[PDB]
Design a protein around this ligand. Structure first.
Ligand code: HEM
Ligand SMILES: O=C(O)c1ccc(OC(F)(F)F)cc1
Ligand SMILES: [Cl-]
Length: 393
C-alpha cells in the first residue's frame, strides 16, 4: 500500500537537481518508503507539517539524522534542544529563546545593518565578486562570531564544523564519513569556546552562561547549549543569503521591485528561505505505530521530511518554482514548525533583511558573469561559488 522508491535523496545527482525527483516523491503518494536507506519519506506540505507538529509520535530524542540513537552511538553528545523532546527540551528552548529574543535583536541591529551596508559598498568598488565567498559567507562571519562573543583565534574552524554537523545528519555515505573522520580538531575548537571564560561578556555565549543563575539550566548544561549556536545558524544563513542573491540575479523583475520598496527586504529573504530552503531535510523517529496518509508506520522507524519539497508543493503554493518577494510566505517550513521551530529565526531574518536592504538601496543590477558551482552537503542546499557583477544604483 506504500510505494517503494529507489530514489537516493542524499546522492550527488539528487543535490544537483532535486526538484523533479521531489515531484516524483510527492506524486507517488502521501507516504513513501525509500528502499535505499530503509526509511519512510513524506514530501507533501500537508504531511510534513502534520509530522512536525506531532512531536509525541514523531520524536526528536532519537536523533534528527538517519542514525537512531536507540541503536547507534551519536557522533557527538546529543544537542540539549534539537535532539530533545518535551519536557527535557523546554527549558533549554526557553533560554535560547531569551538569548536570541526580540529584545536582543535591538542590541545587534545597528551593528548588523552597518556591516551589511559597508560590505555592499565595498563589493561595489570591486565590481566582479563571488557572492558566496565575498558576500553570503563574508557577511555572516563578520557579524555573528562577534555577536557570540567568540575570540579571534580559531574562527577558521567555524565553517568546517557547521558543514560537519549537517553532513552528520545524513546516511553513512561518503559525505558523512569524510566529514566525521578527522573531525576532532573542529570538535576540540568548538567545545573549548563553549566554556564560560572564553566568551566575551555581553555576547550570546556569555548570556547563556548567565542563565545558569536562574535555574533554567545548570552550569554543566551551558556549554552544550552554547554549542548549539556554533552548530546551527552559520551555514543555513550563508546559503539563504546566497540563494537570495542568486534569485535576485535570476529574477531581475524582483530586484527591481525590491529596489522600488526596500521595506520588502525582510519578506524577500523569507521567500528566499522558502524557495531554496537551506535546510532541505531532517528525520523524526516514530515512538509508536502510527497512521500517516493511509499508511501504517511501525514503532522505531525513521521518517524523512522533505522541507524543500514541502515548500514547493503545488497543492499548497501557487507557482512554487517562482521567486516572488510579495508572496505570503507565512506557513512555509523552511524554519520548521511547532515546538522545534528555529529558535534562531530572528537572527537569520535580521542578517538576511539588512543584507537585502543594503542591496535594495545600493545596487541596480546583479549579473552572473562566471561559472556557478553547487555546494554539496547531506542536509544543506546552497552554492559553492556565484560570480556576479554588481552595478551600483
Ligand atoms: C536561513 C537560516 C536558517 C534556517 C533555514 C534554519 C532552519 C531550521 C530548522 C528547519 C529547524 C528545525 C529543526 C527540527 O525541527 O528538528 C531549526 C531549529 C534550530 N535552529 Fe535554525 N535555521 C536557520 C538559522 C538559524 C540561526 C541563525 C540559528 C542561531 C542563531 C539557528 C539555530 C537553531 C537551533 C538551536 C535550533 C533548534 C531549535 C529547537 O530544537 O527547538 N538557526 N532551524
Ligand atoms: O543544537 C544543535 O546543535 C543544532 C544543530 C543543527 C540545527 O539545525 C537543524 F538541523 F536544521 F535543525 C539546529 C540545532
Ligand atoms: Cl563538538
Amino acid at each position: 500500500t506504500i510505494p517503494h522508491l529507489a530514489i537516493d535523496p542524499f546522492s550527488l545527482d539528487f543535490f544537483d537537481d532535486p526538484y523533479p525527483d521531489q515531484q516524483t516523491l510527492r506524486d507517488a503518494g502521501p507516504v513513501v518508503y525509500l528502499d535505499k536507506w530503509n526509511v519512510y519519506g513524506v514530501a507533501r506540505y500537508a504531511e510534513v507539517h502534520a509530522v512536525l507538529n506531532d512531536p509525541t509520535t514523531f520524536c526528536s530524542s532519537r536523533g534528527v539524522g538517519l542514525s537512531d540513537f536507540k541503536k547507534e552511538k551519536p557522533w557527538r553528545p546529543p544537542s540539549l534542544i534539537l535532539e530533545a523532546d518535551p519536557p527535557a527540551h523546554t527549558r533549554p528552548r526557553a533560554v535560547l529563546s531569551k538569548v536570541l529574543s526580540p529584545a536582543t535583536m535591538k542590541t545587534i541591529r545597528d551593528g548588523f545593518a552597518a556591516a551589511a551596508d559597508a560590505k555592499v559598498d565595498e563589493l561595489l568598488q570591486r565590481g566582479c565578486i563571488d557572492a558566496i565567498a565575498d558576500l553570503a559567507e563574508a557577511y555572516p562571519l563578520s557579524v555573528f562570531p562577534d555577536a557570540m562573543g567568540l575570540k579571534q583565534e580559531g574562527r577558521e574552524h567555524l565553517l568546517p564544523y557547521a558543514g560537519l554537523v549537517f553532513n552528520a545528519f545524513g546516511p553513512p555515505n561518503e559525505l558523512r564519513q569524510t566529514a566525521i573522520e578527522r573531525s576532532a580538531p573542529h570538535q576540540a575548537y568548538v567545545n573549548e569556546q563553549c566554556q564560560r571564560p572564553n566568551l566575551a561578556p555581553g555576547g550570546f555565549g556569555a548570556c547563556i552562561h548567565a542563565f545558569t543563575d536562574t535555574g533554567e539550566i545548570t552550569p554543566d548544561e551551558a556549554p552544550l547549549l552554547v554549542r548549539s549556536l556554533l552548530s546551527a545558524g552559520l551555514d543555513e544563513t550563508v546559503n539563504g543569503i546566497g540563494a537570495a542573491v542568486y534569485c535576485l540575479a535570476r529574477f531581475p523583475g524582483e530586484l527591481q521591485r525590491l529596489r522600488s520598496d526596500p521595506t520588502l527586504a525582510r519578506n524577500a529573504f523569507e521567500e528566499a528561505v522558502r524557495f531554496e530552503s537551506p535546510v532541505q531535510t531532517f528525520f523524526r523517529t516514530t515512538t509508536r505505530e502510527v497512521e500517516l496518509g493511509g499508511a501504517v508506520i511501525g514503532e522505531g522507524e525513521k521518517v524523512l521530511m522533505f522541507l524543500g519539497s514541502a515548500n514547493r508543493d503545488p497543492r499548497r503554493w501557487s507557482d512554487p518554482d517562482l521567486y516572488d518577494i510579495t508572496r505570503k510566505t507565512s506557513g512555509h517550513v523552511g524554519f520548521g514548525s511547532g515546538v522545534h521551530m528555529c529558535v534562531g529565526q530572528l537572527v537569520a531574518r535580521l542578517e538576511g533583511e539588512v543584507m537585502l536592504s543594503a542591496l535594495a538601496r545600493k545596487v541596480a543590477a546583479i549579473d552572473i558573469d562566471g561559472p556557478v558551482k553547487r555546494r554539496f552537503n547531506n542536509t544543506l542546499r546552497g552554492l559553492e561559488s556565484l560570480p556576479v557583477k554588481l552595478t551600483p544604483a
